């Protein structure tokens, strides 16, 4: 009935995300003409998405399907920590790609001398490391609820699935460490790039119009709209819940958490398959 | 006397076509047809030599194999070891445009020079383990296109001033000058006898010079575009020539005529390099469409494709003993096949 359709759409999501991420990984790894350091960041993001598709989403799927947790508490803790690490990894990779494009299209002369493989390797290391420590410290060191315990024991008085509980301080700490800073950086960088592109396009248009006798807004808009629509509502609800008295039905929460997965699905079709050179290389594979 | 000169020359040349055509009685394709096909010879890449930073323009095997030297646009004349894929020398050039490269027949000297107008000689072995320039041959007025070693004390150079000159490296002074070409020459292949060589210019022609008397003896025509590469037959009776019209030709020094020709309608690019194997039955050739076809020297049937490169193949050379082929490309990777 409803559950069968739910399984159909969800397994479609897992299969499509796995296929896309695997294709991107294989295309970047096998070819030798695509080895510039930016493609290494793209490949790392693709592997993050592939792991996120291979590990957590089946169990989230079954949980959301039957609203019950047929597993152990330690397994649930592992699941939660892995989910928190693998979302922050993707967000950090998006922010680093944005910074790379900023250096590319704002300081053209000193681009290949400041974006060497060492900097990209350090970027990947700091992208994979900090989320791991942060998530495992919050979950295993029982720090997400350490502030208050009476509310937590009221929270576990009912239901019985392992839902993530965030205090008034832990919630704001998570909000201002995984969403706010990368979002602000992406906003500023892409606004500056938009201004520069607009000025250059206007000059070119003027010159060619005189001698004769908007891709920037269509490109940056797609990326920013996808990222914002897929991430913002979830983090807004997550941060607002602790301040209120937790009166938000999970019927919103499951959709919000599935938007993040859907974003992870929509990454290689905005960062890899949208540019002409990647499609040319893939066709040359044939 | 101008009109008399023109009429006499044109009558003599009309006679010389008749003389060439009189010798012809059949074709080599008809003569060999009754020979079994070569087969489906297949080559698998063994090792890849990496370390260059730009597009290789030349390479040259040593005298006893196991060594090869390559020149790039970076300005490094790296000398590899062909068994351990290691490096023995990293001689840094002065000019950053070299289009020639020539390992000495004895293993002592290396020559390299391009748009600098100067041919330089490098001394590999000295009292200490350091390589330094020994001489700088000057006197040309155009870009160097080819240079080959005749012995330890003589070098032959082919430049862009439409002249070929023979040098003598003890004093840096010319000995003989070969003139008569209209366009620029970009191919200079010596002969095993070390007494004759040919040059292929851009005028779609080729000549046979003599090192002993210093004047032309044979004029070969038949192409419709510039000549990119040339190479003798192991026996020493014929040579192969490549052009920009996707055509390969096997001229003859005995009958003074164009013999059987290679062609294929699916290729529209230009030949870049041509060489023969030891026996003289396989004729490898390069192409601008990113592969290296291998022809049959007798029946003209493609016996394989040496694909695996990413950009244009610029130069290739078959080793002396015959157990190794190597192709350089603009991919900055040398690939030593088998």
């Amino acid at each position: 009935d409803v559950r069968a359709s739910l399984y159909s759409l969800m397994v479609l999501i897992i299969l499509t995300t796995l296929v896309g991420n695997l294709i991107v990984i294989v295309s970047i790894s096998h070819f030798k003409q695509l080895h510039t350091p930016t493609n290494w960041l793209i490949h790392s993001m693709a592997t993050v998405d592939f792991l996120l598709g291979c590990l957590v989403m089946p169990y989230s799927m079954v949980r959301s399907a039957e609203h019950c947790w047929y597993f152990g508490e330690v397994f649930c803790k592992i699941h939660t920590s892995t989910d928190i690490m693998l979302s922050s990894a993707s967000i950090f990779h998006l922010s680093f790609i944005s910074i790379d494009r900023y250096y590319a299209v704002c300081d053209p002369l000193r681009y290949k001398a400041k974006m060497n493989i060492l900097v990209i390797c350090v970027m990947i290391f700091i992208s994979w490391s900090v989320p791991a420590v942060f998530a495992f410290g919050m979950i295993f060191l029982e720090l997400n609820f350490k502030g208050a315990e009476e509310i937590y024991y009221k929270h576990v008085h009912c239901r019985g699935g392992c839902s993530v509980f965030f205090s008034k301080i832990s919630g704001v700490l998570t909000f201002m460490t995984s969403f706010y800073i990368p979002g602000s950086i992406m906003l500023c960088v892409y606004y500056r790039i938009y201004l520069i592109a607009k000025e250059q396009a206007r000059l070119i248009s003027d010159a060619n119009q005189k001698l004769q006798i908007r891709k920037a807004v269509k490109t940056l808009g797609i990326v920013m709209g996808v990222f914002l629509i897929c991430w913002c509502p979830f983090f807004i609800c997550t941060v607002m819940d602790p301040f209120l008295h937790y009166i938000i039905p999970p019927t919103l929460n499951d959709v919000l958490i599935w938007f993040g997965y859907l974003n992870s699905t929509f990454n290689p079709m905005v960062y890899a398959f949208f540019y002409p050179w990647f499609r040319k290389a893939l066709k040359m594979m044939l | 006397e101008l009109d008399q000169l023109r009429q006499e020359a044109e009558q003599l040349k009309n006679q010389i076509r008749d003389a060439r055509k009189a010798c012809a009685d059949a074709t080599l394709s008809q003569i060999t047809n009754n020979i079994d096909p070569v087969g489906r010879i297949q080559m698998r890449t063994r090792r890849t030599l990496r370390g260059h930073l730009a597009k290789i323009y030349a390479m040259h095997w040593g005298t006893d194999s196991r060594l090869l030297v390559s020149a790039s646009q970076d300005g490094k004349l790296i000398i590899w070891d062909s068994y351990t894929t290691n490096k023995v020398h990293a001689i840094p050039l002065r000019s950053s445009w070299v289009m020639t490269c020539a390992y000495a027949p004895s293993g002592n000297y290396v020559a390299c020079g391009g748009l600098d107008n100067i041919c330089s000689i490098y001394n590999l072995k000295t009292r200490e383990g350091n390589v330094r320039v020994s001489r700088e041959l000057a006197g040309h007025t155009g870009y160097l296109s080819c240079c080959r070693f005749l012995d330890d004390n003589q070098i032959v150079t082919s430049s862009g001033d439409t002249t070929c000159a023979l040098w003598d490296i003890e004093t840096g002074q010319q000995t003989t000058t070969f003139t008569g070409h209209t366009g620029d020459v970009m191919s200079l292949s010596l002969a095993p006898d070390t007494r004759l060589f040919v040059s292929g210019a851009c005028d779609a022609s080729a000549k046979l010079w003599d090192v002993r008397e210093g004047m032309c003896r044979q004029t070969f025509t038949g192409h419709e575009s510039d000549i990119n590469a040339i190479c003798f037959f192991p026996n020493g009776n014929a040579f192969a020539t490549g052009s920009d019209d996707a055509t390969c030709r096997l001229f003859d020094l005995r009958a003074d005529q164009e013999l059987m020709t290679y062609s294929h309608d699916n290729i529209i690019c230009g030949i870049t390099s041509v060489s023969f194997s030891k026996s003289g039955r396989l004729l490898l050739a390069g192409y601008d469409d990113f592969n290296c076809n291998v022809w049959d020297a007798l029946k003209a049937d493609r016996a394989g494709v040496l694909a695996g490169h990413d950009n244009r193949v610029s130069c290739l050379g078959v080793t002396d003993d015959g157990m190794a082929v190597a192709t350089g490309s603009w991919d900055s990777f040398l690939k030593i096949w088998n």
Binding site: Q200, I204, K215, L220 | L53, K87
Partner: protein, 240 residues
């Protein structure tokens, strides 16, 4: 064995040197300097300093430029031009005060017509189809002295000068005389027309007014290279 160790150590030394040379090689830009013999290429090169290629290495704003005088080569069929398919720009020095002066070959036409033919050949070359051209124009004061002091006018040698009006973009900041700016902006029109006939947004042309001895040429080259590389980067990400 001991033989292997020496070879491995030598290979390690060579790789260590090649790493430094790779680090050095990525921070330099290569520029060609095609031009006419009588034009002031030598003066500009000597200023940047303070028998074929005479490569000169200068430096401005912590970046290194690598510039090449290639005037020693011969004429026609231009087969060396294939190699310079990775440079950033092609400086093109042309002397404007040569409308009357004729090259040594009396049969040959005016030097300006030869410069136009060379520019057409360079611009329409199939190999140089993705590189911009930084067009210069030297001998500015000589042209002014020629035009002001009567003598043979441009109409004698250039017939179309009569059907010409000064454009609306002319900015005579020095404000010397309006009879010179007319010819100065007329000279640009031929090269711009040669440049605008082809196109499709793959390579541009940056004209300039300068003298042989004056400064700011390095700054102009710097700005033009910045703009060229910025547009090249912008067009990869499907932004421009």
């Amino acid at each position: 064995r001991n033989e292997e160790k020496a070879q491995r150590e030598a290979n390690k030394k060579i790789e260590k040197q090649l790493q430094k040379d790779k680090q050095v090689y990525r921070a330099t830009h290569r520029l060609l300097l095609l031009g006419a013999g009588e034009s002031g290429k030598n003066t500009i090169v000597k200023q940047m300093r303070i028998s074929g290629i005479f490569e000169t290495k200068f430096q401005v704003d912590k970046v290194n430029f690598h510039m090449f005088d290639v005037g020693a080569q011969r004429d026609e069929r231009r087969k060396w031009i294939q190699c310079f398919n990775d440079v950033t720009a092609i400086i093109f020095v042309v002397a404007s005060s040569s409308y009357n002066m004729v090259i040594r070959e009396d049969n040959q036409t005016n030097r300006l017509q030869a410069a136009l033919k060379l520019f057409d050949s360079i611009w329409n070359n199939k190999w140089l189809r993705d590189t911009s051209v930084i067009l210069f124009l030297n001998k500015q004061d000589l042209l002014a002295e020629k035009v002001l002091a009567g003598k043979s006018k441009i109409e004698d040698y250039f017939p179309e000068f009569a059907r010409y009006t000064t454009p609306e973009d002319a900015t005579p900041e020095p404000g010397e005389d309006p009879r010179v700016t007319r010819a100065k902006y007329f000279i640009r029109d031929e090269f711009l027309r040669i440049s605008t006939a082809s196109g499709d947004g793959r390579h541009y042309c940056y004209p300039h007014f300068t003298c042989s001895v004056d400064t700011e040429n390095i700054r102009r080259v710097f700005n033009d290279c910045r703009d060229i590389i910025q547009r090249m980067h912008l067009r990869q990400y499907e932004l421009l």
